[PDB]
Design an enzyme around this catalytic site. Sequence first.
Site, PDB file in Angstrom:
ATOM      1  N   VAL A  18     -63.586  -3.302 -48.454  1.00 26.14           N
ATOM      2  CA  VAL A  18     -63.212  -2.086 -47.731  1.00 26.14           C
ATOM      3  C   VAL A  18     -64.321  -1.045 -47.709  1.00 26.14           C
ATOM      4  O   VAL A  18     -64.827  -0.623 -48.754  1.00 26.14           O
ATOM      5  CB  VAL A  18     -61.943  -1.463 -48.333  1.00 26.14           C
ATOM      6  N   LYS A  33     -61.548  -2.847 -43.231  1.00 25.72           N
ATOM      7  CA  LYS A  33     -61.440  -3.982 -44.127  1.00 25.72           C
ATOM      8  C   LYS A  33     -62.082  -5.171 -43.421  1.00 25.72           C
ATOM      9  O   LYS A  33     -61.785  -5.436 -42.254  1.00 25.72           O
ATOM     10  CB  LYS A  33     -59.974  -4.268 -44.444  1.00 25.72           C
ATOM     11  N   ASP A 123     -47.077  -5.886 -52.277  1.00 28.84           N
ATOM     12  CA  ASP A 123     -48.051  -5.611 -53.321  1.00 28.84           C
ATOM     13  C   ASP A 123     -48.307  -4.133 -53.546  1.00 28.84           C
ATOM     14  O   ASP A 123     -49.452  -3.673 -53.543  1.00 28.84           O
ATOM     15  CB  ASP A 123     -49.375  -6.326 -53.021  1.00 28.84           C
ATOM     16  N   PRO A 126     -50.633   1.721 -57.338  1.00 28.18           N
ATOM     17  CA  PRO A 126     -51.296   3.010 -57.130  1.00 28.18           C
ATOM     18  C   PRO A 126     -52.525   2.962 -56.228  1.00 28.18           C
ATOM     19  O   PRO A 126     -52.734   3.883 -55.460  1.00 28.18           O
ATOM     20  CB  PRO A 126     -51.639   3.457 -58.546  1.00 28.18           C
ATOM     21  N   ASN A 128     -52.983   1.157 -53.719  1.00 26.32           N
ATOM     22  CA  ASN A 128     -52.578   0.947 -52.318  1.00 26.32           C
ATOM     23  C   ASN A 128     -51.720   2.103 -51.776  1.00 26.32           C
ATOM     24  O   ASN A 128     -51.052   1.960 -50.751  1.00 26.32           O
ATOM     25  CB  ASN A 128     -51.804  -0.379 -52.150  1.00 26.32           C
TER      26      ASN A 128
HETATM   27  N1  X64 Z   1     -56.961   3.814 -45.126  1.00 25.59           N
HETATM   28  C1  X64 Z   1     -57.602   3.794 -46.238  1.00 25.59           C
HETATM   29  N2  X64 Z   1     -58.340   4.885 -46.665  1.00 25.59           N
HETATM   30  C2  X64 Z   1     -58.901   4.641 -47.831  1.00 25.59           C
HETATM   31  N3  X64 Z   1     -59.638   5.558 -48.404  1.00 25.59           N
HETATM   32  C3  X64 Z   1     -59.872   5.767 -49.681  1.00 25.59           C
HETATM   33  C4  X64 Z   1     -60.697   6.878 -50.029  1.00 25.59           C
HETATM   34  C5  X64 Z   1     -60.980   7.170 -51.384  1.00 25.59           C
HETATM   35  C6  X64 Z   1     -60.440   6.346 -52.418  1.00 25.59           C
HETATM   36  S1  X64 Z   1     -60.764   6.722 -54.130  1.00 25.59           S
HETATM   37  N4  X64 Z   1     -60.864   5.291 -55.015  1.00 25.59           N
HETATM   38  O1  X64 Z   1     -59.634   7.478 -54.608  1.00 25.59           O
HETATM   39  O2  X64 Z   1     -62.000   7.488 -54.247  1.00 25.59           O
HETATM   40  C7  X64 Z   1     -59.629   5.238 -52.092  1.00 25.59           C
HETATM   41  C8  X64 Z   1     -59.343   4.944 -50.736  1.00 25.59           C
HETATM   42  S2  X64 Z   1     -58.579   3.069 -48.469  1.00 25.59           S
HETATM   43  C9  X64 Z   1     -57.590   2.698 -47.092  1.00 25.59           C
HETATM   44  C10 X64 Z   1     -56.898   1.505 -46.889  1.00 25.59           C
HETATM   45  O3  X64 Z   1     -56.242   1.333 -45.853  1.00 25.59           O
HETATM   46  C11 X64 Z   1     -56.858   0.532 -47.902  1.00 25.59           C
HETATM   47  C12 X64 Z   1     -56.270   0.873 -49.171  1.00 25.59           C
HETATM   48  C13 X64 Z   1     -56.210  -0.075 -50.223  1.00 25.59           C
HETATM   49  C14 X64 Z   1     -56.733  -1.391 -50.038  1.00 25.59           C
HETATM   50  C15 X64 Z   1     -57.315  -1.755 -48.797  1.00 25.59           C
HETATM   51  C16 X64 Z   1     -57.389  -0.816 -47.715  1.00 25.59           C
HETATM   52  N5  X64 Z   1     -57.929  -1.196 -46.605  1.00 25.59           N
HETATM   53  O4  X64 Z   1     -57.681  -2.398 -46.148  1.00 25.59           O
HETATM   54  O5  X64 Z   1     -58.744  -0.416 -45.937  1.00 25.59           O
END
Ligand code: X64
Length: 294
Positions: A18, A33, A123, A126, A128
């Site tokens: 991702v 993704k 699934d 936290p 997700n």
């Molecule tokens: N839309 C979206 N935005 C994200 N941003 C984000 C920004 C910062 C962080 S963090 N660790 O807190 O700094 C985490 C996520 S992830 C996400 C997803 O749709 C997504 C979520 C989980 C697994 C796979 C996908 N995926 O397939 O894109």
Amino acid sequence: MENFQKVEKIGEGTYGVVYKARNKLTGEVVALKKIRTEGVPSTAIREISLLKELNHPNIVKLLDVIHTENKLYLVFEFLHQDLKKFMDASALTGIPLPLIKSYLFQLLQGLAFCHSHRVLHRDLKPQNLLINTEGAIKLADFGLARAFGVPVRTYTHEVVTLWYRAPEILLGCKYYSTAVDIWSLGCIFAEMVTRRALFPGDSEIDQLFRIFRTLGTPDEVVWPGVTSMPDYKPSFPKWARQDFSKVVPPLDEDGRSLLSQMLHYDPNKRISAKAALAHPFFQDVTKPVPHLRL
Ligand SMILES: Nc1nc(Nc2ccc(S(N)(=O)=O)cc2)sc1C(=O)c1ccccc1[N+](=O)[O-]
């Protein structure tokens, strides 16, 4: 990839990577993704397009699905933080109960919606669950009935978290029901409250036994049919159920009552998302603003 500037990698799963990326054309910022295959499953790719129509305020919007060059790209609306990071950032202080309550209520609305459209997440965890500065929380990374061979070893390999897995999945149930998402969400609710994972198993059997040690080894009385499940063994140890007030202190009785209903062993006794929304615990729900450091 030429249509998208990779700003940074924001995570990786067993079969996908991702990235936070920018649409060179629109300038829109998105999560992308990337999934690797010898033709790719059309069936799996099918279910995908379906998710595109699932539009709800508490469900991350799937903007586009692109199959090309033996790769499958999923483009989602971008959110700035996931609940896992937020919980970690809030561990010393704890997330205020009103925010916990608002997040739980919103996630139940999201589930009520997908479940009424016969869509299961499968699934929840936290990582997700995504949050934004406006106090919203959204379901992300829905799992498919089957989109790639049973994951057991990724390119560089990564350990699959079992902490939120429903007992029926662990016992070998072949068909998942909407109840599996309610179980996962209950585990998350408990974790937000106590600031410790409810059932932190490191293997499937350890996961199962940690659930048994807390809620008691299930039997035909509380879960008809459990002893005939595929992976059930008469040899499982018999643990007595622990006093529930010891599990999620200092959660109030309304919260404990709702959690107990989200964690019933029998999938058919487990509360639905719709019913959970009407639980007394939400009588005073509001929508607070989280303090987010981005
Ligand atoms: N839309 C979206 N935005 C994200 N941003 C984000 C920004 C910062 C962080 S963090 N660790 O807190 O700094 C985490 C996520 S992830 C996400 C997803 O749709 C997504 C979520 C989980 C697994 C796979 C996908 N995926 O397939 O894109």
